[PDB]
Design a binder for this molecule. Structure first.
Ligand code: HEM
Lengths: 498, 498, 498, 497
């Protein structure tokens, strides 16, 4: 016996001691007499349409694949629970937080960003850390990253950013000119670029990295009072990264390093956990904040906004079938129960639309019917009907229009959203110049030490060297605005590669 | 109170007397505060993306429709059971017939052919009568209709026939030139055309017509001996048709006459039933038969091949949700359990492919996952996996390749199909010139009386009059070959219409 | 020869004197030797998979259908042009209006609302009248109908309203309880319900009805000044309707009356046209209007807001292939060129989202690539790429991200939208209690005469009689609120029916 | 830098005195600002009326289509096929009508088991599909870089692929799955020997051969038929990558094959292949020692010499990868008059699968996609409608056959060649056909000691991770090929173990 992941089939076989193997059938349940030979007219004759056993199986094989996620395609998944450890009901009325000790089942999927389905785990790229909370008030999806910020602050630039991070439209090759032309033209990315090219750019698996909601969200309590917040989930396994060299070696030796690591950890009882926190900022404090509290390229300094403990995230169950439970799982940031709402973060606002929209495409109109996506701890009752692959009773004969006089589902007033008064013109406000350096300089000078700065620069230069000179200059010009020693160190490294 | 159908919502309401209305939720189960007004900026301001309650419902509304059936789009469904009354185990070893008194759950769908989803029920058109038997050896789909024969004998002509029966490609109107140009050019249609234009052309609802498998099938017993057969299911309600005038009036008064009739009959306890029979022809008889026993335009004379009683079909349950149970139901002629197999009928052979093929398009790759299509009385175990909208557990962590040394499903020797010897050239054999008039003449002459023949002719002439003169002549020439009186009477009526 | 529609095939044949038919090929262009018989082993043997000609054709046949429109499924289409006859550049800078005499190609589709694809044309229901203008500034879709108003004033009730108008989820039959439970519970529908059950409820074809954009839209001129407007296109053939008896008779005789009528009119040179007008309201006037100027259930009195002539709409070309040019045509209200914008009408706002959304489902992600939907008089250049059935060069090797330093497409500042400053909280504002009777009373009293009010009441009572008494009472209560005579007349008729 | 890297720069340059196009929405409406969304106030929520944003975002959300069930990772190119010799005595297909005749072609090279973001330089067979756009329609020769395959019956294909891919629970490559299947189905011995040899990892796509693999049927002008094999030998020469170098490249450049081919064509180094055929008469098909339609068998060159026919030349790169490569579709059933199938069970199964999988991956009207459209033939038939129906949908032409209105007619000269058969319509077992003879000829005569050593090391290196009982079964099969083959692998396994 090797690692648990390797022994998957052996264990499956063993669990079935009373080896009476099931009868092999067609999709419609008809028993198959011989699924090892096709029907022909005579030993060396042609194949007949009459062989439905063949067609039935082949037609399905021909349809096994579904579109991969447009971003975050390569990932790993696990399941467990969320347990409340502290009382934050003064901030939020959400049932998931109602009592200390209350557990809510969770589903999680970790992932890289740019790489497709057959790409390596151990590569520099941010990491996805999505959490699905199956609450009594429906599903709550906290779709986070392993960073508290992001590259851009306006959603209309997201498709372009992702395009620049992927393959050239003609050559289908990664293109550093694309990567850096966009980044140098859009210096808002300076903060996240700095995080990305640091040591945490390549975590040692999924268990040794933090998780963040990134966006600023809104919490509403029972009295209707609201505050803005941030979600943080620190790894109880401690931060641990892979060196550029080891990451390179592993991407070849085991492209599925992250998947294997997580499966084996759980299989052997080493269940990973994260301590769940929140930062709180009142509406009054939001007015005085030195930056836009809804700018996704900014963090809320811990000094001024201390982490407030809330609970724990524990992963103790591996998927039984990867496609059904991981590949098909869908997280929608808009899935929020009463007590948790969205903030005016332009980026968050854009995601409110994007996720359900893309899910209806890659999964299907009724993707919420898929078991792993089904809000099984809440009764779904509404006036929505039909659609492709309607896998339930489609709500039977219940009246399908609202309002009605026949006893069908009623709206619950207490669930109404929190209302705020906004003022200003309805138009496109430019945010390209919303301070792209202040917090980046703080990160460079105060958070990192000498060794870490040297590596950051070496990592940046190592990739930037392949972009054209004019792109290198504009990129260095941006790093120099962050801190003159930051830009010059990179320029020096570039000079020698050139 | 009116008919049961009208009181659908009222009864639903009453059945929930001592209950509180459910909470209206989003698709993800999040309670909704107000689903009667959208979120806007101020009383007369723009709509916000934040209103995910709105877009969650709208998006689903936008995706309610799926493609209708390419043919037989307009229909009605009901459920019940099939009961064995006689012992035919000497002919077939199929479990569905294993013992007298055995009941098997069934699902049925009645329909017209050419009309789309919003067409009228009472129109001259053959009628679909598909029966799905949920047996222990998988689902057995007997996709029959109200006639023992069909218009053509080769499947490669089916798409063309259907096109001719539907709308003109440019105008989108019914086109009698298309209809009769095809029928006149393909005289093998004379038999079913004669049945269609007779009184049997417009049944009084679905309960007053017979059901037939039409094709010749093959039965195999426990010793491996096989015979050919026909499936017949005669109405216990008695044959009742509608007159041309009544059918036209009803098509305007109640386009859903068949749906209502069936629903009300079942809702009032008047469960419709059919007596199930089979005709048997030994391989030896198949050789001496005057025509091609596998020619779909020919019947097996009752005098030479008597009906052998087998059982009863009873419909005692209305669907609860039409879309999920009727619109989404899928019957595949290729769905046959051990003991029942296909025959070399060219038409049936073509149907072995078309149905699951159109179902993978209409419903989706995993259409067999939809409840009503699921072979719930059987255990589905194989090596098929994944695909869009994959429900259930996708067969867990079971070994996905065959053969394997890990205890996964195994083929069952007893399920092996019956072998028949064939020899000859592998090519396209013309069947256009097979007998196209003999059996038709017997029908025109003996099966029908003088009064019925008159109507047949005026029904034909009534529609044919709108086709060009050259098409009329060609069609009349065909009728004249069946019987001089047949052609002359039609020509006489055409003469005055013209 | 008969009418042009009937002679479609004949004319096609004729336009080919030297009738040497083209060679019959597979989808891949391989010539077919015999498409009338399939390949079998021996004259009475089984079908071979080797018969690719069969499968190729059958497989396409099995996939001919696509989902019908969720609403307005039944319709007809035609093509022509829009011609500017008057100068309104003082209100709008849109290129389509830039100069008197300017001609822009248009596409139009007329339709009913509730019935499915095989339903009748001559039924009571509003009528769709969508116009696609292929301008140099892209496509402009004015998705109108034959009434200036609608049943509801908030988009979130649309799915429910439509459900109440269609079939019972269990019985699949039209349900008057659903129809009237909804309408009586939402009296804002009184205005459009009064219009619907009036003579204009069943137009005599599409050529004899008016067109209206219904909603309030916004126009912006070169100076950046804006005004609100209404779009009107009056029938030059004059208003003409069908009596209840004639409409009923025709729904039986010719379910495709509207299609035939339109086709034959254009085919014989009787090209229908409409005079295009607009009503203009200043932002100042919008502040003093007695009702909400953006309420879909209200009209702008002509006395206070006169029609201002703009141009002509002429349909002079029939479709060559219905499926390709009509069934697949897609109109998006959000398709507006510079100079034409949306207003804060909650209903319009909702439609901005719904159409493109439903089109991505019904047609596909790249539905704009379908010839009839392609903005062929404009150059499409952006950063959108890929997606299923990408039928173009996919913009070749052009840089796929914005911004970029490589010459890819740039935004055009002059196209920037008009900006307004709105005030108030961001929440759901209830409009259920806005004025629901005032304009309706005027309609009943002034717009109609004694003779018309009599028919109106009979039509309403004729359908309402089949709803339960409690629903009849609630409905009459609302009608009475509009005018005593209105309610008492319906009740009197209802009394005899009951 | 290499041409590949300068893609955007060259694009910019080709548009010297041009001026950028106006950025528009999908519907052609000019865009004023596509860098900021519409909000109420500088810090307010997003509005639904920002259709510029939705139009773009909704499309981004739909960019992905399912990848090929197999052969997902690949590279494409275009060029022509030129006839150099006359084989019209064997086939009447227009593509071979005269010396010098050039026909446009589309080619896609690929691996097999890996998904879209996987490495090019890994052990795996290679796909070498060729689409010939002929006057008689498209001819798709969907080949591999091997003349044989692992199995001989199509019903085992889904299982084989499954064993080559990821474990259903762990989503990891599983050597138990790989070897349990191969050891249980020894017919795979021949192709497994090819796979684990030096040619298991070619140096790019230009340094490998292509084969149609299956036995096909050629019919000439007087309706006479013979069986054949298609072979296309690399004019650049066979060149492989060592295991160490392949490993390094898989990390250094997962898109090595793509880059190599692109730059080669970009710099004028147009790769070519010499196209040949092998011919076997119907009589020789009777005398052949094995089943001539058995995919695990080759026709010895000594008895069936390579007959030269023409050249395959790749001289044009894709302008848009998604459009010309990701969306390209090859159907083995696409054969013009003069070229037919043979009773090879594997080929017969492919006749169904490809068009079938294409209707799912691309769509019902996938043949309407430019790269797949048979542009050098007039398509005319009775097929209509379907999703994303581009074109005129054949206009108002009569849609039923037969008709009296002048619509398309069948052409009698296009009829298939008929053969006589006799037998029961049943499932005949082929699991026990010869699984070792030709394999032995490969191990003994074709390879030398260095190569046999490398072969055994390659096999043991991977086989070592499977359970012992699987190892023994595998070794048992290799032993049946040659004692020295199994003993050497076992000795290496003893060591790794
Ligand atoms: C406005 C910008 C954004 C847009 C439009 C966007 C869009 C998307 C889309 C379309 C997907 C694929 C969804 C699927 O197919 O299941 C995706 C996945 C993902 N995104 Fe975002 N994204 C944005 C910002 C972000 C940010 C800021 C975060 C982190 C807080 C994030 C985290 C993720 C994660 C974790 C996944 C993978 C979920 C999974 O494992 O299934 N994205 N994103």
């Amino acid at each position: 016996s090797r690692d648990p992941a390797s022994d998957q089939m052996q264990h499956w076989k063993e669990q079935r001691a009373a080896q009476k193997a099931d009868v092999l059938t067609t999709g419609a349940g008809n028993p198959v007499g011989d699924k090892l030979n096709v029907i022909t007219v005579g030993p060396r004759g042609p194949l007949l349409v009459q062989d439905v056993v063949f067609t039935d199986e082949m037609a399905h094989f021909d349809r096994e694949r579904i579109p991969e996620r447009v971003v975050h395609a390569k990932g790993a998944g696990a399941f467990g629970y969320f347990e409340v450890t502290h009382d934050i009901t003064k901030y939020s009325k959400a049932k998931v937080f109602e009592h200390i000790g209350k557990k809510t089942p969770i589903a999680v999927r970790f992932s890289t960003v740019a790489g497709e389905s057959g790409s390596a785990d151990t590569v520099r790229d941010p990491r996805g850390f999505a959490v699905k909370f199956y609450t009594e008030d429906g599903n709550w999806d906290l779709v986070g990253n392993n960073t508290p910020i992001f590259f851009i602050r306006d959603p209309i630039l997201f498709p372009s950013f992702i395009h620049s991070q992927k393959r050239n439209p003609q050559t289908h090759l990664k293109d550093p000119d694309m990567v850096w032309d966009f980044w140098s033209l859009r210096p808002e990315s300076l903060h996240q670029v700095s995080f990305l090219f640091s040591d945490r750019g390549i975590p040692d698996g999924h268990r040794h990295m933090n998780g963040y909601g990134s966006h600023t969200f809104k919490l509403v309590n029972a009295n209707g009072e609201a505050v803005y917040c941030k979600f943080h989930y620190k790894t109880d396994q401690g931060i641990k990264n892979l060196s550029v060299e080891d990451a390179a070696r592993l991407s070849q030796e085991d492209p599925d390093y992250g998947i294997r690591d997580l499966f084996n950890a759980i299989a052997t009882g080493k269940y990973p956990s994260w301590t769940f926190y929140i930062q709180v900022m009142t509406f009054n404090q939001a007015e005085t904040f030195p930056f836009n509290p809804f700018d996704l390229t900014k963090v809320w300094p811990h000094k001024d906004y201390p982490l407030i403990p809330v609970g724990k995230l524990v992963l103790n169950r591996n998927p039984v079938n990867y496609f059904a439970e991981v590949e098909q799982i869908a997280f929608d940031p808009s899935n929020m129960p009463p007590g948790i709402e969205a903030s005016p973060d332009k980026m968050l606002q854009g995601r409110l639309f994007a996720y359900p929209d893309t899910h209806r495409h890659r999964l299907g109109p009724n993707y919420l019917h898929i078991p792993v996506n089904c809000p099984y701890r809440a009764r779904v009752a509404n006036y929505q009907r039909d659609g492709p692959m309607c896998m339930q009773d489609n709500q039977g004969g219940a009246p399908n229009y609202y309002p009605n006089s026949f006893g069908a589902p009623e709206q619950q007033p207490s669930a109404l959203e929190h209302s705020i008064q906004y003022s200003g013109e309805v138009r496109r406000f430019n945010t390209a110049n919303d301070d792209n350096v202040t917090q980046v300089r703080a990160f460079y000078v105060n958070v990192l030490n000498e060794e870490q700065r040297k590596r950051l620069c070496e990592n940046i230069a190592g990739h930037l060297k392949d972009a054209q000179i004019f792109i290198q200059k504009k990129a260095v010009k941006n790093f120099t605005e962050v801190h003159p020693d930051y830009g010059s160190h990179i320029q020096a490294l570039l000079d020698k590669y050139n």
